[PDB]
Symmetry: C3
């Protein structure tokens, strides 16, 4: 054994790459112009409280922008606030309030209907996309790091523009969206705020993934967008957990009035310089499905802010989930089924253990702890920090302070928002090597999740384990106007014998 001889290179500064006539070219350009926007009104007046069917119907010739946007405006009256409350850095909007408010949507392009679930799509997509991409989808793209929001918390999403570390990554007032607070008289227990939110529609086949430079659709003889509107306070309005209530009242009462909506699209003629448009254009339009869910009452006997190891280890196991093909990715989360407080963060559980079964291969990931589960999710796109993901006590010293009495320790305690575990079939390390992403092969999956919840000792709430699948799914636009979509399925042998790409 002797070391092999290696070739050498002489590196030098890029400064010495002299610009000359041999390597410098002058660019002119064409672009998608900004003179091409159109406002599309809905077929009927939108419901005044934001609850009802909403339809846009507008044939569009030539090219239409791939990421159309919805512009909602409304007034929100918040009641049962303690008198003379400043409300500084305490009121704002929830993350992706437009898409949160649309449980189901149907898009018609030239007779082809696409049915999808925006609220469900954006609930997953907010946790595994680039934050700068997400800031182009919505002005309220920041996702809650912690299960309670307090005014003084450093990344409090309801911090105003001047009080935010990064105003783009806040959902407060004076940040990314237009607003107006109605005049507040001395001794008033309510506030009225007008909002305007301009947000991209997350629904098949829109190009919300490629929001930076979306590929346009062409020659839409029929173009209908049908929305199941649920623009209700619970989906849109955010109130910090340290805002005080009037004596007697349990929660805040919020009413949406003056609700209006329109769709904003770009429409323009293709330039001659790009040449002939191809006969068949392909669009990346992934399919998210809830593969299985199961719920249970979770009662905490021991303090969630106490010893981590003594926190109640709740277990939920799904039924056997039958799948006719193998998805590219899965997503696991344990969420509160019925929210206790309507205007607080979504209460997810901190997943401490994960057992997965695929066919007869059992007990996968049972060995793994939180740190390894965080790495797993992070390697598949998870976009938040461990402090959030873990669901652990985030302010231990604040709670352990002797100045805080035993009765006030839960109130001061703030936990990480909770876990979302993204995993691929290739992460499982299955004996059955035919179980590959995009394989046309039937499988049965079962997922057990061990988790801890942020509820106080002697209290509880219902938590649902949800397992989602993210499938590769393409939409094809044919020259004659026809649209089709289908999964990109192949045999195991085709996929295993495909050429290697080390990336």
């Amino acid at each position: 054994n002797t070391p092999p001889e290696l070739d050498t290179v002489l590196q030098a500064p890029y400064a010495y790459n002299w610009p000359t006539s041999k390597n410098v070219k002058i660019a002119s350009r064409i672009g998608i112009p900004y003179s091409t926007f159109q406002t599309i009104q809905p077929v009927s007046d939108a419901p005044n409280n934001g609850i009802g069917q909403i339809t846009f119907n507008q044939p569009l010739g030539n090219l239409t922008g791939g990421a159309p946007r919805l512009r909602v405006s409304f007034t929100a009256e918040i009641k049962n606030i303690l008198a003379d409350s400043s409300l500084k850095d305490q009121i704002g909007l929830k993350s992706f309030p437009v898409n949160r408010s649309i449980p189901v949507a149907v898009i018609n392009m030239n007779g082809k209907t696409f049915t999808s679930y925006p609220a469900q799509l954006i609930k997953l997509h907010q946790y595994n996309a680039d934050p700068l991409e997400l800031a182009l989808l919505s002005p309220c793209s920041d996702v809650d790091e912690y299960n309670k929001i307090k005014a003084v918390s450093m990344n409090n999403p309801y911090r105003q523009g001047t009080e935010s570390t990064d105003s783009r990554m806040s959902r407060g007032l004076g940040c990314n969206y237009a607003y107006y607070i109605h005049p507040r008289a001395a001794g008033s227990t309510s506030v009225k705020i007008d909002f305007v939110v301009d947000e991209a529609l997350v629904a098949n086949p829109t190009q919300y993934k490629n929001i930076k430079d979306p590929v346009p659709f062409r020659n839409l003889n029929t173009f209908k967008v049908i929305l199941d509107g649920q623009f209700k306070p619970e989906n849109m309005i955010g109130i910090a957990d340290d805002v005080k209530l009037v004596a007697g009242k349990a929660d805040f009462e919020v009413d949406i009035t003056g609700f209006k909506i329109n769709m904003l699209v770009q429409n323009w003629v293709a330039p001659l310089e790009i040449g002939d448009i191809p006969k068949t254009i392909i669009y990346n339009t992934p399919l998210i499905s809830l593969e299985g869910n199961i719920s249970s009452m979770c009662l905490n006997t021991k303090d969630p802010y106490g010893i981590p190891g003594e926190r109640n280890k709740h277990i939920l196991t799904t039924h056997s989930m039958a799948m006719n093909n193998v998805p590219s990715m899965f997503a696991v989360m344990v969420s509160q089924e019925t929210p206790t407080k309507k205007f607080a963060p979504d209460q997810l559980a901190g997943i401490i253990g994960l057992e997965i079964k695929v066919d007869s291969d059992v007990g996968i990931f049972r060995e793994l702890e939180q740190q390894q589960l965080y790495e797993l999710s992070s390697s598949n796109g998870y976009n938040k920090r461990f402090s959030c993901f873990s669901g652990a006590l985030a302010n231990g010293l604040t709670v352990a302070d002797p100045a805080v009495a035993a009765g006030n320790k839960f109130k001061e305690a703030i936990f990480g928002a909770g876990s979302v575990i993204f995993f691929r079939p290739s992460d499982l390390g299955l004996k059955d090597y035919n179980v590959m992403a995009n394989a046309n092969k039937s499988i049965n999956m079962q997922v057990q999740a061990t988790f801890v919840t942020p509820e106080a000792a002697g209290t509880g709430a219902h938590y649902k384990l949800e397992v989602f699948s993210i499938r590769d799914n393409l939409t094809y636009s044919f020259e004659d106007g026809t649209f089709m979509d289908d999964l990109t399925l192949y045999t195991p042998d085709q996929l295993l014998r495909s050429p290697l790409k080390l990336t």
Copy 2:
């Protein structure tokens, strides 16, 4: 119609790309050494208060660094400060204080003179470059997000090193630049602060755009830099808007003393390993010009912190701007003509509507709201958030607080610094397709801007609408020592028939 067949690939981790003798190489290197720096003194003693012509005249052989820097040092005495004011996080320097202080500069390279306007150049450039790139130009690269600066504001640019979220993105003391505060006696109403600022000269033909890897100049037999020195307090010194004044005084009085300046350059011999230097070296040296401006008195009758829609919609329309060729980009802004307060942020207006005319094509962008104008500018490099760009009330809850009395609501109100709208000719979507960037074609442009201002009800100030052009302009260095510069102009047919690059 049937979906087409797609080829498949098998992706695998980069960890399996095994390093071997076939794909590993050992590097050595040459570089631009740090033993090559020279301090060039000016031909005569600089004025004590930094006001007057300043000239550097120093021939340099072989290679000279492409981004030469000016190092200024001075003492600033700030008077009329309320007695026993702490001044914590309230005093610093304005953004790009050296280049701000140079209205015009003349650089001579081997007989060829380059006349440019550094204050005008950096005022645009600070809004459309990468912040990290800008931090290499100046230690005071951070640009004001808000029209008022207060001590507690989270991104207050005069926060000290220890109180900043990012010390590189602060202009405060104990950040990127050397300083010394003179001892402050009890009951003193003034402060003396020594400053030293090492900043890259932004003047043609310097390589301020390519600050990371600047291409050097060669064989400068004549090298003169003539500066119109206007290093006056207004251009350099920054004082927070919540610093209290002594009773009687309207504004702070500031005096610059002990002003010294020198030019820092790198000078070295070209190494043999890079080979022959080309006969003609090309330098990117863009030409910024004020194509038109117009001003008028803007009086606000209604409150700027009140209803956004009821804010006074001021209009300014330029005269017809005749241009012999078509620039690559335009920049629009509406700013205070005469600053009210000398040491506050530059007051820009929030542009709510824009109307552009090019030849007989009229009313372009009249349909666009603020969100779309922000998108437009951001797509062309605009480097700040919507909270800043909009000019909207940034701290609504703080103002709407009942604890704040009616007379103090304006004092509490903080607005976005205001708009700068960058747009290209291709963004306009003109019928006349021959109007291309870098086309040798005459055009007449006219710009109408609708805007809102941050002044209180029953007050006003003069605002100027400025339209700048950014032209592609190259400087050519010939082997015999000669320097020329010229625009990169072509026929519309040449540019339209050029090969496609989709990027």
Copy 3:
């Protein structure tokens, strides 16, 4: 002379790069699974106070993960705290506490021993790596910007999860690592905290540099990891400088108990789809060595918070450092030899001047100021801001405040943590062109550093100038199981005649 003709290109958006069957492909994949993790216990129980030799001995077949991790758990009792101290944002761990605690480590792979110094390695590596890479190595990756940590400081590294601007870049409780604070009774002067830290071992030949996608090791039939355990309070525990002591006590007393440790590895069989694993695998395993050091008592007569120019200019000059070959990089730093306070940041000096001698070439960099030394270090990967690097007074206004009496001015003063100057041989600009990185040429180096220290007037401490070398060094893994390592040395003529790579 005339400007040359330049070719033109027509640029267009990426949106017109239509996805079709000609340019779209469907990926399935294989990966390094997350079912492959294994816990390795040490051969004997670890010392209860974390002090002593610790050994792992576990043969592993097939592929083993290239970046193995050490998981330590312990209880830390902190005494002499003033009664009823809240301790909010004032307790955490120091940076890279596991690797800090290992002065020397020996790794055996198939009979080949690699002796390295993790505490020394990580002390350099923390300053010249990408922060996101460093966060994958350790949950306490954030390095101190300042020489004192106070609770209210904006980037205070002991800010809790909820109080941090970025919880990943904090070392506080409720951030990246698991913890539990034991209950605190009223009037108690001590606190007990359980910690669990999961950190990558920084020791040859581990793949800590390629932490994102590390290349695995093959067939470790002998695999031993021998650690000089120094997991003592001084290396692990962090306490803010504004935590108050009980009367009579000079410093805090800290005890480590219940110390346990294990090694986390991945172990798996290579998949058939990647093909044959090459016979000889190469691993990047750089060699850090302390080339010279010298110490001295540094007594400050004048105030460090006073006039910067009047700060005591201490000088230290190394003896002649004989080297048989030329390293790719050097690192210079001036550190406090014996820490005054065990739980404060590492006190480095602010280097204001650097004089280097190489053979008969003398006085290199004597001309350079702090700004240029910062530029030099930054160009070779230095990852901190100037406010830290300089060692300058970071909070001048806070100190200059008349409200702060003369006796309390030093206490309020906070300085940058200090300088680390990375430089290459190519930065020196030597007349002797044969002195190239990776050359087998003997050289003699001497380094003089002029610096300022953060100690008060009438006090001092011992400071050591250290000069490190960073050599390119490769580890070769042959098919039979043999491991070798060696430097990548060549002749000056080989390296100079090698092909150019302008990057």
